[PDB]
Ligand binder design. Structure first.
Ligand SMILES: CC(=O)N[C@@H](Cc1cc(F)cc(F)c1)[C@H](O)CNC1(c2cc(CC(C)(C)C)cs2)CC1
Length: 372
């Protein structure tokens, strides 16, 4: 649901995906990063070395001040600014205009990125995690309350098939995937929180208490680049990934996500890097499904062929970031408290292996896999 939004995303590797928006009357055009890992809609509203444009409130006939300040601290970066409401629309989007909350960003630190082409962020997760508090209605919530747009969006993030993709607001576009959608419950409405019931690398169960995979949570987050795994899980995965690829040897800064590794163009040894299967809780009792990630997703290319290890240690739970979401079509079915995965039409290539969404699997005591 529908052709107008196909290919409405762009970006640079490791700097997120953005969609074109306009705010104010007359309309001012900004590129906005699409972030299911937070819930604030915020935009450059003042000069910055890295911004090529920004939101000019005084130039907008429709702007209203909320006379209240705001700040948001992300994993690394943070911004603060001023709350208002203005009229907002997505040009390659549904055909509508909403009055939404906007944080006019006045100061920032390590937020905007030099390469960038985006001037703001669209937090698509739920009011619970919004700043300054849950009474600040998120953008998707206002678009739903104010229009007829169904309460569902879908993200097809593609990986260089200078990245691109689609954000279908309001529905599912059957032209963007193959095979069946498989759905996992949204465990609680705050982040897009899910439960991982099993983990296998090259078909070997990690054999951990399934609570460790969700410790203290597992989320789907398009605003975080890497797959981020709890310490105990990170250690076990890097252990098997090391051993699968031991034929060759790598700097330590490589496994820590720091320094790139290189091979002669067209000779990257993909076969020595294992596939990772994440099993998600399903819709029916004792039933789950798996997504399989290929090394082409977790060895993210940096500009010979050169890559960073795109899995990292977490102390805040599992993060399924952009590299996991790439080559899947991921449906955020808020209306039904579920997230659907299918093989995307921009799926990642290997000459001998494929990324897959497969089910059904039987898995006992999936309830026990949730932390607390
Ligand atoms: C890398 C990163 O941090 N990405 C930002 C998006 C981003 C992209 C970018 F290019 C630059 C940034 F500074 C931020 C994304 O929201 C991360 N989502 C999560 C967190 C959100 C928050 C804020 C709350 C929800 C507590 C208010 C803290 S961790 C769950 C992990």
């Amino acid at each position: 649901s529908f052709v107008e939004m196909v290919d409405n995303l762009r970006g640079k590797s490791g700097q997120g995906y953005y969609v074109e928006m306009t705010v104010g009357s007359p309309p001012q055009t900004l590129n906005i990063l699409v972030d299911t890992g937070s819930s604030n809609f915020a935009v450059g509203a003042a000069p910055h070395p890295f911004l090529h444009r920004y939101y000019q409130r005084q130039l907008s006939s429709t702007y209203r001040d909320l006379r209240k300040g705001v700040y948001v601290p992300y994993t690394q970066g943070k911004w603060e600014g001023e709350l208002g409401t203005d009229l907002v629309s997505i040009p390659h989007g549904p055909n509508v205009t909403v009055r939404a909350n906007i944080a006019a960003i006045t100061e920032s630190d390590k937020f905007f990125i030099n390469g960038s082409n985006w001037e703001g962020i669209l937090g698509l997760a739920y009011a619970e995690i919004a700043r300054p508090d849950d009474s600040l209605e998120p953008f998707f919530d206002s678009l739903v309350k104010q229009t007829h747009v169904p309460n569902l969006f879908s993200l097809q993030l593609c990986g260089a098939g200078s990245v691109g993709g689609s954000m279908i607001i309001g529905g599912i576009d059957h032209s963007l995937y193959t095979g069946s959608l498989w759905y996992t419950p949204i465990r609680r409405e705050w982040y897009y929180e899910v439960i991982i019931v099993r983990v296998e690398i090259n078909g070997q169960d990690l054999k951990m208490d399934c609570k460790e995979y969700n410790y203290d949570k597992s989320i789907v987050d398009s605003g975080t680049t890497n797959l981020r795994l709890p310490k105990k899980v990170f250690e076990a995965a890097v252990k098997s990934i090391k051993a699968a690829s031991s034929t060759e040897k790598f700097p330590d800064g490589f496994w820590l996500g720091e320094q790139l590794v290189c091979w002669q163009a067209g000779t990257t040894p993909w076969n020595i890097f294992p596939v990772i299967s994440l099993y998600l809780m399903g819709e029916v009792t004792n039933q789950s499904f798996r997504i399989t990630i290929l090394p082409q997703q977790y060895l993210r290319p940096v500009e010979d062929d050169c890559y960073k290890f795109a899995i990292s240690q977490s102390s805040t739970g599992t993060v399924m970031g952009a590299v996991i979401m790439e080559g899947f079509y991921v449906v955020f079915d808020r209306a039904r408290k579920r997230i659907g995965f299918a093989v995307s039409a921009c799926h990642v290539h290997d000459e001998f292996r494929t990324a897959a969404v497969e089910g059904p699997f039987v898995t006992l005591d999936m309830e026990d896999c949730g932390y607390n």
